């Protein structure tokens, strides 16, 4: 038989990365580019439709527009590699490559998307300069859900209040917020650790000088 080979059937991919997923098919001498047909699909979405040595863009699902390319140089070496730019959680799923070249076969590939809380926004506001009470806030987005552990500079656990909402900036991604209210002094250090539930990303918060530009 003419058989499409897949060197791996499972890709774990990092949110926002580029992935290349490979279908291997036999090519002996120079390939008849005309004869070659390559389809890539994820579930019901068409990604790549390569026929008569060209792509039909008119048939590609919009969610794969500008971000999906067949590597045409690879085609000569029996390689139907699909590259997807800026991978999101919606790109997780089962991919099929379909090749017709002296016969016709398909293979399934599973893509999983890992979305870590690796990016942490922080904010330190004084609540009352007299008590020296401050509000420390860390936020990050990821999947799945995360707890936030607040630690002192001596790595003792402090109690904060966490708020988990569905991201508005993207989809399926959780937006996690924790704030620590504590009486503290300039140059004291705090850590907030995002710990996914079911990896540990830590930010350093340094207490700044009390601002002198403040109303009564």
């Amino acid at each position, epitope marked *: 038989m003419f058989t499409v080979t897949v060197p791996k059937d499972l890709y774990v991919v990092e949110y926002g990365s580029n992935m290349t997923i490979e279908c291997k098919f036999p090519v002996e001498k120079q390939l*008849d580019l*005309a*004869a070659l*047909i390559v*389809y890539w699909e994820m579930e019901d979405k068409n990604i790549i439709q390569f*026929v*008569h040595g*060209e792509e*039909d863009l*008119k*048939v590609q699902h919009s969610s794969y527009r500008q971000r999906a390319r067949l590597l045409k140089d690879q085609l000569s070496l029996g390689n139907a590699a699909l590259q997807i730019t800026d991978v999101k959680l919606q790109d997780a799923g089962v991919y*099929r490559c*379909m090749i*017709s070249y002296g*016969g*016709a*076969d*398909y293979k399934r590939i599973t893509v999983k998307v890992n979305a870590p809380y690796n990016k942490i926004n922080q904010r330190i506001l004084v609540v009352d300069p007299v008590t020296s009470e401050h509000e420390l806030t860390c936020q990050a987005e990821g999947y799945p859900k995360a707890e936030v552990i607040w630690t002192s500079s001596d790595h003792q656990v402090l109690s904060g209040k966490t708020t988990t909402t569905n991201s508005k900036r993207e989809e399926k991604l959780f937006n996690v917020t924790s704030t620590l209210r504590i009486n503290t002094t300039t140059n004291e250090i705090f850590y907030c650790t995002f710990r996914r539930l079911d990896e540990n990303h830590t930010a350093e918060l340094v207490i700044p000088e009390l601002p002198l530009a403040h109303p009564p």
Partner: nanobody, 118 residues
Framework: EVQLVESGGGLVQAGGSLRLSCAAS????????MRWYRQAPGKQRELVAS???????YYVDSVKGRFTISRDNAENTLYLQMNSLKPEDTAVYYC????????????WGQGTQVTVSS
């Protein structure tokens, strides 16, 4: 599963013309790509003409400007108009279809003999 039945083959003299027809029955689609191949006696089977879903066509060099592949999706019929026949056009012509609807599969007709007398 799909059946392809080619027709129109026969005896034509050089400079003559004929239309081949392929009737496709079963799990067909306007998204399927279809083709005409031919095999001269003890030569290798070659691709003659190709039509994509988008109606985009490829022709082998030896038939460019003489042969026209077209599709009627309503009647599930593929056509080859063969003009300015030459003796080397003599072959069995096979209809071909790449199915995607149930699964991804290609299907072959049994072929139709074309004989170009000089």
């Amino acid at each position: 599963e799909v059946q392809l039945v080619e027709s129109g083959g026969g005896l034509v003299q050089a400079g003559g013309s004929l239309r081949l027809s392929c009737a496709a029955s079963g799990s067909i689609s306007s998204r399927d790509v279809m083709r005409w191949y031919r095999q001269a006696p003890g030569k290798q089977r070659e691709l003659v003409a190709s039509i994509s879903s988008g109606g985009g066509t490829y022709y082998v060099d030896s038939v460019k400007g003489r042969f026209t592949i077209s599709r009627d999706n309503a009647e599930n019929t593929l056509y080859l108009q063969m003009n300015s026949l030459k003796p080397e056009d003599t072959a069995v012509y096979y209809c071909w279809d790449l199915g995607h609807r149930p699964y991804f599969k290609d299907y072959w007709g049994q072929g139709t003999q074309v004989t170009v007398s000089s």
